Amino acid sequence: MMKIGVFVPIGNNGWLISTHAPQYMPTFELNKAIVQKAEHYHFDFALSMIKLRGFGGKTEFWDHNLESFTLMAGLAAVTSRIQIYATAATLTLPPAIVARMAATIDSISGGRFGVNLVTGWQKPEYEQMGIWPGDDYFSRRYDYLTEYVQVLRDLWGTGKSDFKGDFFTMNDCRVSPQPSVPMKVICAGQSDAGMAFSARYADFNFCFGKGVNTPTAFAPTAARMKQAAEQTGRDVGSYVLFMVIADETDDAARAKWEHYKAGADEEALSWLTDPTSAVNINMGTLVGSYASVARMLDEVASVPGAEGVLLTFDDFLSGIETFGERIQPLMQCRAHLP
Numbered sequence: 001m002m003k004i005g006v007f008v009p010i011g012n013n014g015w016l017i018s019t020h021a022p023q024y025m026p027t028f029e030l031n032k033a034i035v036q037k038a039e040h041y042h043f044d045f046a047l048s049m050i051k052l053r054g055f056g057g058k059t060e061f062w063d064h065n066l067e068s069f070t071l072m073a074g075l076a077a078v079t080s081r082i083q084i085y086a087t088a089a090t091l092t093l094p095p096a097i098v099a100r101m102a103a104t105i106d107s108i109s110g111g112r113f114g115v116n117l118v119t120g121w122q123k124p125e126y127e128q129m130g131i132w133p134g135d136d137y138f139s140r141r142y143d144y145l146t147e148y149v150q151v152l153r154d155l156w157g158t159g160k161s162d163f164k165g166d167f168f169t170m171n172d173c174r175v176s177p178q179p180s181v182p183m184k185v186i187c188a189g190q191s192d193a194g195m196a197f198s199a200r201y202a203d204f205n206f207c208f209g210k211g212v213n214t215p216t217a218f219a220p221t222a223a224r225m226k227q228a229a230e231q232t233g234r235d236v237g238s239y240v241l242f243m244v245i246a247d248e249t250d251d252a253a254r255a256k257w258e259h260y261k262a263g264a265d266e267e268a269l270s271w272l273t274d275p276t277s278a279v280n281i282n283m284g285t286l287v288g289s290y291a292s293v294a295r296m297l298d299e300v301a302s303v304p305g306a307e308g309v310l311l312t313f314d315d316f317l318s319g320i321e322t323f324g325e326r327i328q329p330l331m332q333c334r335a336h337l338p
């Protein structure tokens with residue numbers, strides 16, 4: 001039994017850095033079509049990242065990015081069942097503002113909203129607007145995030161905070177209304193510090209899938225996350241990020257993957273710096289027939305600590321359709337759906 005989410009393309013061209021990949025801008029209407037089709041095929045959740053600066057090149061890769069809370073507020077208004085997660089770049093928003101935005105999208109969605117809390121680590125995204133705290137941030141960022149989430153938990157739990165720390169001073173800070181359901185916090189910590197944060201404050205932790213057609217290769221990461229969760233006694237499972245490149249046959253899927261690699265936008269790859277390829281930021285990739293991808297996702301579901309997968313596709317509109325019509329019906333870990 002495994003949850004499935006869609007990582008919505010809030011940035012241009014999704015997760016392929018290639019002149020041979022589909023070229024598209026992130027629009028509301030594209031993300032609306034993607035999330036409504038994901039909801040139709042019983043995807044459990046939709047998440048958007050936040051990406052405040054791109055990598056340029058021929059494809060202007062991630063030069064064009066919408067903002068995560070406003071995108072997800074719009075998507076909440078045109079959905080009814082799928083869970084909706086926005087990402088907070090915690091250097092860019094005061095916690096009381098995130099608290100109130102989360103209560104707002106709770107109201108829009110009827111209790112289907114959560115927040116992905118990130119420290120940020122790419123200095124230029126912050127330096128460009130004069131808000132990088134300096135190179136001490138690399139080591140202290142989970143101290144900062146710990147204070148941030150304490151403020152969030154106070155406001156969502158009681159409506160008020162008197163929290164006083166190194167980074168925040170709350171003087172009877174108020175945020176009402178409080179969310180109608182317990183607010184879900186998710187984290188994407190890979191480091192020991194990040195997983196220790198997730199074990200204390202997250203409902204679940206996102207990690208990277210690893211390799212091409214080695215679906216269980218992330219297992220050591222999920223094991224580290226289970227060990228971190230033992231230290232708090234909390235049930236904090238792993239949701240694993242993969243790109244799915246599926247077709248009618250293994251050969252046809254491999255032909256598309258190779259076509260994408262052949263178009264690699266090397267100027268964009270420069271800025272960013274059977275093996276994984278920089279063409280999708282060395283993402284965990286599942287490349288095969290619909291049946292091969294279903295088998296490989298059933299293998300993810302068997303890894304200790306894995307509770308779900310977060311999916312990108314080479315083509316989201318056709319990828320979600322073929323996932324729902326051809327892959328998901330063969331998955332033992334989705335036999336619970338209608």
Ligand SMILES: Cc1cc2nc3c(=O)[nH]c(=O)nc-3n(C[C@H](O)[C@H](O)[C@H](O)COP(=O)(O)O)c2cc1C
Nearest residue numbers: 049050087118120188189190191194206207208241
């Ligand atoms: C699925 C996923 C989504 C992520 N989304 C973002 C994002 O939107 N913005 C961001 O600054 N970092 C993002 N990250 C980076 C993580 O928050 C984190 O910094 C990274 O996994 C490194 O781990 P560490 O922070 O413990 O070193 C993401 C990571 C993963 C696995």
